[PDB]
Amino acid sequence: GPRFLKVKNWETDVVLTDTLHLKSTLETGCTEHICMGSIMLPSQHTRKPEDVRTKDQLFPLAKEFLDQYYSSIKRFGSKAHMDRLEEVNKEIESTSTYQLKDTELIYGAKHAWRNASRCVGRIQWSKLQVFDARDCTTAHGMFNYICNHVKYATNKGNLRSAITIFPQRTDGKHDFRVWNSQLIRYAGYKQPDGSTLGDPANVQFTEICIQQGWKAPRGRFDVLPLLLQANGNDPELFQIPPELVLEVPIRHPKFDWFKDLGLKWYGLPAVSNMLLEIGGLEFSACPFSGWYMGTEIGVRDYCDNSRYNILEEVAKKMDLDMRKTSSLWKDQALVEINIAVLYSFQSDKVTIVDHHSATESFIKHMENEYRCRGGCPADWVWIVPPMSGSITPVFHQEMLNYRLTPSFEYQPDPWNTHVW
Amino acid sequence: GPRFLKVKNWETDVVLTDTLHLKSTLETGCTEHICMGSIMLPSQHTRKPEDVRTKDQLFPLAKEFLDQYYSSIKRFGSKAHMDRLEEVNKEIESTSTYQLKDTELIYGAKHAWRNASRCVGRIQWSKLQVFDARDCTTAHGMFNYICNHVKYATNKGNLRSAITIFPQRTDGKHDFRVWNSQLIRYAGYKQPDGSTLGDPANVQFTEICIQQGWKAPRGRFDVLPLLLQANGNDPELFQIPPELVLEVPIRHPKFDWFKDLGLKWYGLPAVSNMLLEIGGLEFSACPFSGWYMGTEIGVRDYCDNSRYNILEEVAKKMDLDMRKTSSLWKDQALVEINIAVLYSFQSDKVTIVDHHSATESFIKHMENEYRCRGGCPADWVWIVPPMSGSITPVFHQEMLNYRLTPSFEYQPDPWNTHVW
């Protein structure tokens, strides 16, 4: 398009016009000469270790947000609008920061999710539950908030989206951080015999916990303890109450032998290592949760080489011809492993969505966003499922990726920085 | 990287440094604000209908290429180098164009393939057979060349890569074009009963052929006739000799009932609608061929909704639970359909490669290119297979995409333009 970019769906021939990209100022990492669309973390905003924004650079951002917030409630330029701007303005010059009103925080959180270009489950964005933990001051208080969140979101298996927001960052008072990558994950332990017990992706973190005294069960699926850091002080270990951690034993609807594989997984995915930015303010601790898309577990978590990597074993038990990749034994065990995962969760009545339904609703969500918002930033590389790509509708959908704020950003690991 | 960009493999932790991107001048379609990496044909160079380059804009391009060609043979700045430049120079000012020496044409073709960022089979790039058809002047001559190419490349099933290059374009003398999208493809016919017989992707072309008198067999897998245009004159219909068209009846190594599905496909993929650009010169007719990667047929050709879309039928015959997408019946029939394709080709001893071997050799190719060329332009969106993405190594490989020349470009369909 001359000024209005268009994305086409090649399976349905549907075309959409994107104008929403015009309000993006953050950089993508690409240039007119190179495309970095497949790079994991282009440091364009991967959050620096580098201090905190200053009073000068903070007000423009604070304003951009408020202008947007009021424009959404069609009150742009109102006395209220102008009053709030001056409020914050003065509030920043005096205290070097500012506080979001409960309403602005809820709008900011929802939009950080609405703007998450890598999220395929955004059709749910406006149905997020926000828990305000900005009054929290200690690690025990953080533990309590997280426990209440896990209980709420799990809802006995009928998962509900939620996010708990702790105190924003400040010059030096200090940072609240949840050292865990996800609220619920399994430990990983290296074994001199070359092998790795548990989840290989959590080995260096499990080490930290052990260093902090965690009594590791040295098992396969050991739910790790929470390592909470409040007001910049050293983190503390906490054990999430077992009765609060819902898990699902993995079994197959045909292969009774599948059970014996000893496969199990937790039902609540809860990312706790990202950063939420709203009006220049940075919330380094903002754990949030939704529900699983089957492939996340069956394809990536179980079959990723660097993860549990269960493909061989599963393949042996099926007695497949593993002497030639051309037999597609990996592809076959993969489909079964995922049929099991979906079957298991559904039996235990635990909320889960298959990649066919998820991608289907994302196309619907996209159409809703282009109709009501002028577009929808989407990352094709991440939106398309790790298995059966072309049989899902998103594979055939052209997507425009750009960065909007509020947003969720990556941030340095706290231990690769935290002192003493 | 500060000036040197890096791509990481997240499964193996291998990092590579790209410097090769620095010699790209063509635009990708992205900006620092928007990423268009998932857009099919960004008109950045999708070849305009707009005339032909002029003497002025043609020499810079001609030079850039020759400088590169001699630099490759470590003869940059040689008398030969300088002599050739002046040759062409004068040759352009006088005849408004120039002729590539056989050696430059072979180097240009190989590199257009070497630079094809969307091609996963580039490890073979330097083993391409070039057929010089620049002396051709008629459609019958074009037919002969194409027949000799098909015979050569098929090699009785032991496929060999090749490309046949016809006369380059000139101001007005005229264009040589192969109206077919691929040398070998099946016709598509619309049926008032809503359905479509054959390949839905070839309906509008099949119509043209019929309009030109083709005696369509009105079948399912009807090999279309060649519609050749030489020196800008109207195209002519030609029937590729049946004995020259190798096909493979699709059957399964377990499901004897698969045979009865009536599935068949040709063994030689031969793209004939792209444009080859070497030193500013445009070769609008340059059909080229290699061999199939299984998924191209089993996943896209057979299971694409807008293609043969055989998923239901195949699923019924397997008696799968098609009442819920959550049963993953589509994924399952998909794996079987592709096991069949690979099995079938291998039995008939016809060259074919599975997505596991293809992606494996592309990672090796990438490492070879970063070691010897400073990098390798790759399009992640296209390199990752349409099924079982994350279990193949390219899914986990960060890729940098940029445009280098010589290259293969898209060009307008000849009928949506050709006159009388």
Ligand code: HEM
């Ligand atoms: C309702 C259930 C939801 C589903 C099915 C869903 C699904 C997904 C999936 C499949 C991914 C890919 C993650 C990966 O491959 O590692 C993702 C990424 C993401 N989602 Fe959602 N999501 C949901 C809810 C949420 C919520 C409640 C938020 C925030 C309020 C959110 C924010 C994001 C973000 C920030 C990413 C990007 C992660 C990254 O780039 O590392 N999602 N989501």
Ligand code: HEM
């Ligand atoms: C040796 C066998 C080869 C294999 C296995 C192979 C495989 C592939 C695959 C899987 C694609 C994706 C095409 C699609 O999805 O439609 C592709 C694209 C492409 N290949 Fe190769 N290729 C081979 C040889 C060649 C040759 C001989 C040339 C040229 C000299 C070439 C040039 C390209 C180009 C230009 C594209 C991009 C097509 C587009 O963007 O529409 N390939 N190749």
Ligand SMILES: C[C@H](O)[C@H](O)[C@H]1CNc2nc(N)[nH]c(=O)c2N1
């Ligand atoms: C290299 C490449 O960017 C990387 O492997 C990406 C691809 N797509 C992905 N998509 C999702 N949803 N999650 C991931 O972790 C990835 N990894």
Ligand SMILES: C[C@H](O)[C@H](O)[C@H]1CNc2nc(N)[nH]c(=O)c2N1
């Ligand atoms: C919209 C999206 O770009 C489109 O569907 C792409 C994705 N990847 C692809 N990859 C290959 N090899 N071939 C294709 O035709 C496509 N289609």
Ligand SMILES: CCCNC(=[NH2+])NCCC[C@H](N)C(=O)O
């Ligand atoms: C945090 C709510 C959204 N979560 C989600 N569905 N996917 C991303 C987090 C889960 C993580 N990829 C895992 O498989 O363990």
Ligand SMILES: CCCNC(=[NH2+])NCCC[C@H](N)C(=O)O
């Ligand atoms: C032209 C040689 C390379 N061809 C190839 N392997 N793939 C692309 C062309 C085949 C086309 N996508 C098809 O499935 O019909």
Ligand SMILES: [Zn+2]
């Ligand atoms: Zn890009």
